[PDB]
Amino acid sequence: AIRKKLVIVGDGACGKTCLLIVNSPEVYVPTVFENYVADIEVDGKQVELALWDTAGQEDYDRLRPLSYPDTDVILMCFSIDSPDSLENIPEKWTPEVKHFCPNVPIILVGNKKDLRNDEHTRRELAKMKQEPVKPEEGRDMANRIGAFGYMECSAKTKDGVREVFEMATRAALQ
């Protein structure tokens, strides 16, 4: 068997847990999610991808790094409806990941892509002089932080989700 560990990293509000859930329910959406192994096939290779959530660890800087050892790929997450969550990637999360996970492959993921053209979303952001994150911004940031690649998804419509974890698996197999 090929076994790889994924750790998802990012702001608490960016929907990290929802993303892991929708790779694993019209009948209920769980608030919390424990470690789970997904079976993913890329390029004729079967990989057991262990998914580690970091939700709830944002405010405990001493406890949080225990999630990092033996990581094969970091899923760096932000939400497209939150430019602030994107700025926290170079400001907070990338330095932390580079420190605790040196030479570990990173993929950059923009979640909640369905909210990009959401009128309610755009007016809420407009009040704060902001707009939803553009795809080019994600590609540029992926370059800046040395990510394997950037792609977007919606845990709501499940669009892009499968491809995200397939890209993560490819990065892990590097």
28 binds other proteins (CB under 8 A): yes
d(C-alpha 59, C-alpha 166), whole Å: 30
The closest of 103, 131, 127 to 117, measured between CA atoms, is: 131
d(C-alpha 77, C-alpha 66), whole Å: 19
* Closer residue to other proteins, CB minimum distance, 35 or 157: 35
27 marked among binding-site residues: yes
The greatest distance separating any two alpha carbons of the chain, rounded to the nearest whole angstrom, comes to 51
Residues in CB range of 62: below 8 A, 6 or more apart: none
CB of 42 to other proteins, least distance (A): 17
d(C-alpha 54, C-alpha 121), whole Å: 26
Q: Which stretch binds other proteins (CB under 8 A): 60-68, 78-86, 132-140, 159-167?
A: 60-68
d(C-alpha 46, C-alpha 102), whole Å: 25
32 binds other proteins (CB under 8 A): yes
* Closer residue to other proteins, CB minimum distance, 32 or 128: 32
45 binds other proteins (CB under 8 A): no
Q: Are strands 73-79 and 149-152 parallel, antiparallel or unpaired?
A: unpaired
15 marked among binding-site residues: yes
Q: Which stretch binds other proteins (CB under 8 A): 49-57, 114-122, 134-142, 165-173?
A: 49-57
* Closer residue to other proteins, CB minimum distance, 27 or 128: 27
Interacting residue ranges for other proteins, rule: CB under 8 A: 1, 3, 27-28, 30-32, 34-37, 48, 50, 52, 55-57, 60-63, 66-67, 69-70, 90, 94-96, 98-99, 102-103, 145-146
